[PDB]
Design a protein around this ligand. Structure first.
Ligand code: HEA
Ligand code: HEA
Ligand SMILES: CCCCCCCCCCCCCCCC(=O)OC[C@H](COP(=O)(O)OCCN)OC(=O)CCCCCCCCCCCCCCC
Ligand SMILES: CCCCCCCCCCCCCCCC(=O)OC[C@H](COP(=O)(O)OCCN)OC(=O)CCCCCCCCCCCCCCC
Ligand SMILES: CCCCCCCCCCCCCCCC(=O)OC[C@H](COP(=O)(O)OCCN)OC(=O)CCCCCCCCCCCCCCC
Ligand code: CUA
Ligand SMILES: [Ca+2]
Ligand SMILES: [Mg+2]
Lengths: 238, 69, 45, 54, 57, 537, 75, 88
């Protein structure tokens, strides 16, 4: 959810796609560690013992592949199919759309992020909108995390799935959150449709990735889950 | 037939590409059979034939395109 | 003309005492250019 | 790329609205120029073959 | 009228490089080199003016 | 008066030998500046917060962009692709000189003005800020006001057109000047690779020329080519750029493949296993490395079917490369190995680094997997651990292997081995922690980072410092080799077999080599190949 | 007071890129209100179809362009 | 020897040259003159001008973009600027 010190794994998060991504990564790492250690040992052993002082005679008369090149073609290709298939069914699971519930808008021009929840337009005629800003270092709350907090923090209810809308009106930005594993490009002119689903009720962290000028590193993104009654109180508060 | 012409002029690009390929192949087959004709010269003659056929089919198509009742 | 190369194509004469300072100074200035480059952008600041 | 998938401010047509009627008709001076170029190529090939004929 | 053979034999008798074999070629390069040097000298000041934010007035 | 002779032998000279040395020198003077830029940028991120600077983010953007552009287009391409080809390809084909000497002379001299104008552009009030991959809206006159990035665009344009012009003569030279009895199939692997890179570069770069010119015209002619309000789609720019960027690294790394396949046999005294299979698999790689370009656009938001089509084919690249690595592994075993030789050391160290980098590359070729690593430090680790481990190692091995042929001198084996070990350790501990930094979910191109990342940056900084000492030692060893007057025989890499008498070998066995270049004297003659060598037809 | 109801599963375009949807809903709503009537129920749901997913900030510029008539649409 | 082959090649080249002269003075000329006449008819049909239109949805918001001043003249003129077909 948040970066730690001397980390080795990715993190502990909560998102239906994030668990599947971690599972696929575990399987793929299990695949590649085999080949990596095998090639390392082969390189080490073919040289450590076959130095000139111990092998003054070279079997120079073997430069034909009878049955070895065929196995070279097949076996790694078999591994390739074995890794391609799970990723393919994961992707073909993800490309579908569930039953829509509500949408959020994430338009951001330069060094600040604006969020809109215009689903609940009613007789009040007061659509809710605000802007999340980089909190200054001096005004950080005692015990806060530098470079990873905002003043007007985003609020999304838990266990409710949202069809997030990604849009921009300036140089291209990105909308990333490693815990949820959902990302897309804030490409101007065109809107990007992405989904989301939070299982727990906790504070999630993230920021943009695609450079957008001098202050590309000054728009952190924080989204935290809330219960239904807290969500309703938050909505009626404004 | 009052129906064949509708498909003949409905998709001008695919049929025009097909007839261009047919002309190219036929001209290559016919020209590349002589002695005093090098490959670049035969290719140039085939391309000239293709240009002429393209011009005439363009004029024919723009002539028949007026029937948009 | 049939000359035999002396196995010496260095683009410039080299020897021990004098040319070492010239070579090292050229290396130092071409190493330290980025310095003046980074200083230029923070001159009027 | 600019033609097959026009943007949504273009009126869903590659020929711009209001400028579509201001486009270039297929039958005008450029067609004459194309026929001139074809005849020029024919004349150049004739000249090359005659030069081959010394 | 076909003087190409005569001039060929006239010009093959010299050992000059092919870019100076034809007489009169040298007079078209020395002022050319001077003009190139002047262009370089002017472009030095032009680039120096471009990098240093300012404009003459 | 030798001054006229001096400038006629160096400036008004079109001999291939007298030009490749200048290629190496130009590469070196670009690489030093790039290495210092990399050192300063890595020292900036030693600890969190503004450090040695007044938080100047634009200055950091200028630094990263300059490092990337100058080290990708002024260090490796000109000093590897054509530097070791123009000198050596005529030797292995059986020709005395390249097809067009004047264009060969011209191509080299387009680069110095490019370097000067790039430095001038970087010395503006703002400087380029779009990075190595500049993007239209950021480059738009809205962000930058001045002659900063236009000159960078111009430098890229002219360098590309020069490289294209520096590769037209090579293909003609190695397609028409072949030796009598030298079938194109029987060509050595190195020239095969270099011709493949030449054809790929010439086929692809024009696209960059056109796209870069049309994108640059947006700043001056106010064209709507890529304006969001003008109907332009920047995804078209990304597609145009990555129809070039993806095969560029392959055409940069293929000379490393050839030089490794040349270094292994001679220092192993064993013929290369499966030449025909290797070259046909490399041809398959060359053809394959064009239809896959959208792996750099995985998180932009394209359609499902296009993503599947251009992600499934990303995996098939690995199979021929794995076959090549297995063939080299098979070649190494059985035959004799002189592991103490510096070219052998570099060749051996190349394989493990290249294969781990390839594994990292196959990690992030899936749209399901790239979303967790796109535009983070993990891709930085992958592409750096492939580029600086393959191309740099190949260049170092080629230099240490063919240096006597270029000049006719001997280097110091002890200092060279020490430099190799120091550089290997430094570059292994530089890009190591970045794997963890990108695995945590932290983006790239950020002068500031959240506090829980300091340790790995601290671990990387020391290796970054170590690399500078490696560079210093290489400079010292190069100077020593240049002024040591250590003679070299005709074929220093030929040794008597296990049953060669010390008197029979010296008098009835000299003048034999696996390749032509070792037959001639180490300082090669100006006019070699007076008569064409004729083989068995 | 409030219910969870917004744009449904648009069968016209199920892919990720759905930029044309905003313009299509806008022009369809304008055509719908031009004919039929004003107080008719059905296209009130179409009104929600270009505000829940659209930024609503381009809507201001759309109004500015359409008020003077330069808006390039059939209706 | 050389005489027979050179005679045959020159004869074939001369025959092709005569055929191409017939091509260029038999069919190309009529096509060129017909196209010229049709082009003149099209050019003379539309000599009504009236090329000054405004207030009918003017501008369209993507016409004559000015982000960097045009080098020629004041900055609002193009190289092929015309006083009858180019407006604002
Ligand atoms: C230097 C040369 C080079 C090489 C050789 C490669 C090799 C590969 N690269 Fe990489 N790549 C770059 C240079 C290179 N790359 C650069 C510069 C970038 C960044 C671009 C930028 O942003 O500017 C990049 C980025 C990049 C991305 C972009 C990720 C992102 O930013 O979102 C992707 C994604 O697909 C990718 C894929 C690959 C693949 C599949 C290979 C394959 O060729 C690797 C195949 C090799 C092997 C896999 C090892 C040997 C094989 C075997 C032992 C067989 C058995 C193996 C298995 C069955 C596991 N590369
Ligand atoms: C040609 C490929 C190449 C090479 C060799 C390098 C070399 C290095 N690069 Fe770079 N780098 C890129 C390509 C390359 N890079 C690209 C494309 C980018 C992205 C740009 C962008 O984002 O805009 C990038 C960006 C980039 C960043 C991005 C900053 C950020 O995201 O925070 C960092 C930071 O760590 C970095 C580090 C390094 C280091 C430490 C080295 C090296 O120090 C590693 C060790 C190497 C050496 C120290 C040099 C050895 C040289 C010799 C011994 C001399 C030999 C000379 C001859 C004989 C001629 N590189
Ligand atoms: C990258 C895309 C840009 C377009 C490509 C063209 C690039 C410029 C043209 C270079 C010639 C191409 C090869 C011709 C065949 C050939 O080889 O001509 C033959 C000679 C070299 O061979 P030789 O005399 O030794 O042969 C031996 C004869 N038996 O060529 C030349 O002397 C080139 C003439 C010098 C011109 C170099 C300056 C280039 C200016 C570039 C700027 C203009 C374009 C700007 C674009 C925006
Ligand atoms: C991902 C990893 C999965 C691995 C799965 C592959 C399994 C099959 C591979 C084994 C086939 C080759 C064995 C030789 C059998 C034989 O006996 O071949 C016959 C020849 C015998 O010599 P001859 O031809 O002169 O006989 C003449 C008969 N009159 O042998 C050889 O010449 C061996 C020479 C080349 C082989 C070197 C192997 C180097 C490493 C190979 C790959 C290492 C993998 C590392 C990762 C595990
Ligand atoms: C050195 C090579 C430069 C030329 C390269 C040619 C490449 C062809 C493809 C590029 C498209 C060109 C179209 C523009 C032609 C034109 O004239 O543009 C149209 C405008 C005016 O037309 P209009 O509005 O009146 O039309 C409407 C009629 N009523 O005139 C110009 O802006 C003049 C400047 C255009 C550039 C041509 C001359 C170049 C001189 C500067 C060199 C720049 C070098 C850049 C860095 C190397
Ligand atoms: Cu916002 Cu990069
Ligand atoms: Ca820092
Ligand atoms: Mg990205």
């Amino acid at each position: 959810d948040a970066p730690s010190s001397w980390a080795l794994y990715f993190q502990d998060g909560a998102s239906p796609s994030y668990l599947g991504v971690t599972h696929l990564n575990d399987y793929l790492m299990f695949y590649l560690t085999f080949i990596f250690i095998g090639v390392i040992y082969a390189i080490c052993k073919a040289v450590i013992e076959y130095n000139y002082n111990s092998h003054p005679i070279a079997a120079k008369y073997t430069t034909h592949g009878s049955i070895v090149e065929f196995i070279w073609t097949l076996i790694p290709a078999l591994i390739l199919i074995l890794v391609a298939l799970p990723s393919f069914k994961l992707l073909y699971l993800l490309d579908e759309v569930q039953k829509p519930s509500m949408t959020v808008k994430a338009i951001g021009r330069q060094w600040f992020w604006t969020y809109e929840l215009n689903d609940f337009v009613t007789n009040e005629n007061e659509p809710v909108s605000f802007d999340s800003y980089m909190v200054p270092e001096e005004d950080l709350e005692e015990g806060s995390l530098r470079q990873l907090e905002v003043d007007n923090r985003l609020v999304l209810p838990i266990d409710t799935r949202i069809r997030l809308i990604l849009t921009s009106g300036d140089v291209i930005h990105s909308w990333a959150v490693p815990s949820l594993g959902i990302k897309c490009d804030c490409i101007p002119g065109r809107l990007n449709q992405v989904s989301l689903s939070i299982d727990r009720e906790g504070l999630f962290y993230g920021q943009c990735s695609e450079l957008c000028g001098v202050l590309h590193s000054s728009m952190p993104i924080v989204v935290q889950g809330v219960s239904l009654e807290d969500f309703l109180a938050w909505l009626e508060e404004n | 037939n009052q129906r064949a012409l509708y498909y003949f002029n409905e998709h001008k690009w695919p049929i025009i590409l097909g007839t261009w390929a047919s002309t190219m192949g036929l001209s290559l087959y016919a020209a590349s059979r002589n002695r005093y004709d090098t490959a670049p010269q035969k290719l140039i003659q085939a391309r000239m034939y293709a240009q002429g056929v393209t011009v005439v089919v363009l004029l024919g198509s723009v002539y028949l395109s007026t029937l948009a009742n | 003309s049939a000359p035999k190369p002396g196995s010496t194509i260095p683009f410039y004469i080299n020897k021990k005492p004098l040319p070492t300072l010239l070579y090292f100074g050229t290396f130092g200035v071409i190493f330290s250019i980025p310095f003046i480059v980074v200083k230029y952008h923070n001159r009027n600041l | 790329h600019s033609s097959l998938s026009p943007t949504f401010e273009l009126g869903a047509v590659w020929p711009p609205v209001g400028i579509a009627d201001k486009t270039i008709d297929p039958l005008e001076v450029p067609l004459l120029n194309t026929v001139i170029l074809l005849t020029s190529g024919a004349s150049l090939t004739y000249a090359h073959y005659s030069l081959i004929a010394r | 009228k076909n003087t190409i053979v005569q001039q060929q034999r006239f010009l093959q008798s010299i050992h000059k490089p092919t870019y100076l074999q034809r007489p009169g070629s040298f007079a078209l390069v020395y002022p050319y080199y001077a003009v190139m040097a002047g262009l370089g000298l002017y472009s030095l000041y032009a680039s120096g003016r471009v990098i240093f934010g300012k404009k003459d007035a | 008066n030798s001054w006229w002779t001096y400038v006629n032998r160096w400036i008004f000279s079109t001999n291939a030998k007298d030009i490749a040395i200048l290629y190496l020198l130009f590469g070196l003077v670009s690489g030093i500046i790039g290495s210092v830029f990399s050192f300063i940028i890595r020292m900036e991120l030693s600890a969190p917060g503004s450090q040695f600077l007044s938080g100047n983010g634009q200055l950091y953007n200028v630094a990263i962009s300059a490092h990337g552009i100058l080290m990708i287009f002024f260090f490796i391409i000109p000093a590897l692709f054509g530097a070791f080809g123009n000198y050596l390809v005529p030797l292995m084909i059986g020709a005395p000189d390249v097809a067009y000497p004047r264009v060969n002379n011209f191509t080299f001299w387009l680069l110095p003005p490019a370097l000067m104008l790039l430095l001038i552009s970087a010395l503006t009030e703002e400087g380029p800020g779009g990075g190595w991959t500049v993007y239209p809206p950021l480059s738009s006159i809205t962000s930058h006001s001045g002659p900063a990035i236009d000159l960078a665009i111009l430098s890229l344009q002219l360098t590309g057109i020069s490289s294209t012009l520096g590769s037209v003569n090579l293909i003609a030279t190695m397609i028409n000047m072949r030796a009598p009895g030298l079938s194109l199939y029987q060509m050595p692997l190195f020239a095969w690779a270099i011709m493949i890179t030449s054809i790929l570069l010439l086929l692809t770069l024009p696209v960059l020329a056109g796209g870069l010119f049309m994108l640059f015209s947006d700043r001056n002619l106010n064209t709507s080519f890529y304006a969001p309000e003008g109907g332009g789609d920047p995804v078209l720019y990304q597609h145009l750029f990555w129809f070039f960027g993806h095969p560029e690294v392959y055409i940069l790394i293929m000379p490393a493949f050839g030089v490794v396949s040349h270094i292994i046999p001679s220092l192993a005294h064993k013929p290369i296993f499966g030449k025909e299979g290797m070259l046909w698999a490399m041809l398959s790689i060359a053809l394959l490395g064009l239809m896959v370009w959208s792996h750099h656009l995985f998180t932009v938001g394209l359609d499902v079917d296009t993503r599947a089509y251009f992600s499934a084919a990303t995996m098939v690249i690995a199979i021929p490369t794995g076959i090549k690595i297995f063939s080299w592994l098979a070649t190494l075993t059985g035959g004799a190995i002189q592991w103490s030789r510096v070219p052998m050391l570099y060749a051996i160290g190349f394989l493990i680094l290249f294969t781990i980098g390839g594994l990292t590359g196959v990690i992030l070729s899936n749209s399901v997997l790239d979303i967790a690593f796109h535009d983070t430090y993990f891709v930085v680790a992958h592409f750096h651990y492939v580029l600086s481990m393959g191309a740099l190692f190949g260049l170092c091995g080629a230099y240490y292997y063919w240096s006597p042929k270029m000049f006719g001198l001997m280097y110091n084996e002890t200092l060279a081995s020490i430099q190799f070990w120091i550089l290997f350790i430094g570059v292994n501990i530089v890009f190591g922690p970045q794997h963890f930094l990108g695995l945590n979910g932290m983006p790239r191109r950020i002068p500031d980072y959240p506090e829980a990342f300091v340790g790995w940056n601290f671990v990387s900084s020391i290796g970054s410092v170590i690399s500078i000492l490696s560079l210093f030692l290489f400079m010292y060893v190069m100077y020593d080799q240049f002024t040591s007057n250590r003679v070299v025989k005709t074929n220093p890499y030929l040794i008597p077999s296990y049953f060669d008498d010390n008197v029979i070998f010296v008098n009835e066995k000299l003048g034999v080599a696996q390749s032509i270049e070792w037959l001639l004297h180490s300082p090669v003659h100006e006019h070699a190949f007076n008569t064409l060598p004729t083989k068995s037809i | 007071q409030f219910t969870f109801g917004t744009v449904g599963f648009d069968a016209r375009f199920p892919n990720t890129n759905q930029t044309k949807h905003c313009f299509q809903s806008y022009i369809d709503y304008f055509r719908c209100i031009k004919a039929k009537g004003e107080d008719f129920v059905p296209c009130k749901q179409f009104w929600h179809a270009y505000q829940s997913l659209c930024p609503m900030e381009w809507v201001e510029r759309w109004d500015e362009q359409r008020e003077n008539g330069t808006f390039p649409a059939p209706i | 020897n050389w005489l027979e082959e050179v005679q045959a090649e020159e004869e074939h080249a001369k025959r092709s040259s005569e055929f191409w002269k017939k091509v260029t003075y038999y069919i190309g000329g009529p096509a060129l003159i017909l196209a010229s006449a049709n082009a003149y008819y099209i050019y003379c049909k539309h000599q009504e001008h009236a090329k000054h239109v405004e207030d009918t949805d003017p501008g369209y918001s993507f016409e004559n973009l000015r982000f960097k001043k045009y080098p020629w003249g004041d900055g609002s003129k193009t190289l092929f600027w015309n006083d009858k077909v180019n407006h604002l």
